[PDB]
From Swiss-Prot:
It is found in: Cytoplasm; Nucleus. The KIX domain mediates binding to HIV-1 Tat. Changing residue 83 to E/R: Abolishes interaction with ASF1A. The chain holds residues 1081 to 1197 of 2442 of the full protein. This is CREB-binding protein. It comes from Homo sapiens (Human). It comes from the Eukaryota. Transmembrane segments: none annotated.
Length: 118
């Protein structure tokens, strides 16, 4: 119940490999690498449906700038990114299928890391 203290440099070192695993997926990571601009992309309802957008570059910036206090907050951001994509996109779309592949990759990477951090 009393939270152990995680130093930001320890979270960055431990969790960065799991984020690198996502980024290295090609073609599957491409639509997830940067924040979206709905007006430029032609999806103007995106922020109506997706209340809390999330993307790989934003997660990397949060690790780089010490914005997570505990590892589950990082896991929550990765899964927010996944859940937003499964909510917004149709099941036949590239983004939807790519999201499913990233979730498979992430599940394998994150488990031993979460065990090691405690
Ligand atoms: C869109 O899929 C691909 C697949 C491969 C490659 C793509 C794009 N690009 C452009 C990358 C940037 C694209 C992002 C992105 C774009 C659209 C989008 O404007 N749409 C309208 C018509 O097309 C389908 C949907 C939707 C979504 C998008 N992503 C985030 C997760 C928000 C979302 O939930 N959905 C680079 C080369 C490889």
């Amino acid at each position: 119940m009393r939270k152990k203290i995680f130093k930001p440099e320890e979270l960055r070192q431990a969790l960065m490999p799991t984020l690198e695993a996502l980024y290295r997926q090609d073609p599957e990571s491409l639509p997830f690498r940067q924040p979206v601009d709905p007006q430029l992309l032609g999806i103007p309802d995106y922020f109506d449906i997706v209340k809390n957008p999330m993307d790989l570059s934003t997660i990397k910036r949060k690790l780089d700038t010490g914005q997570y206090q505990e590892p589950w907050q990082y896991v929550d951001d990765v899964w927010l990114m996944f859940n937003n994509a499964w909510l917004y996109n149709r099941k036949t779309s590239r983004v939807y299928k790519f999201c499913s592949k990233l979730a498979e990759v992430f599940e394998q990477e994150i488990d031993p890391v979460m065990q090691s951090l405690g």
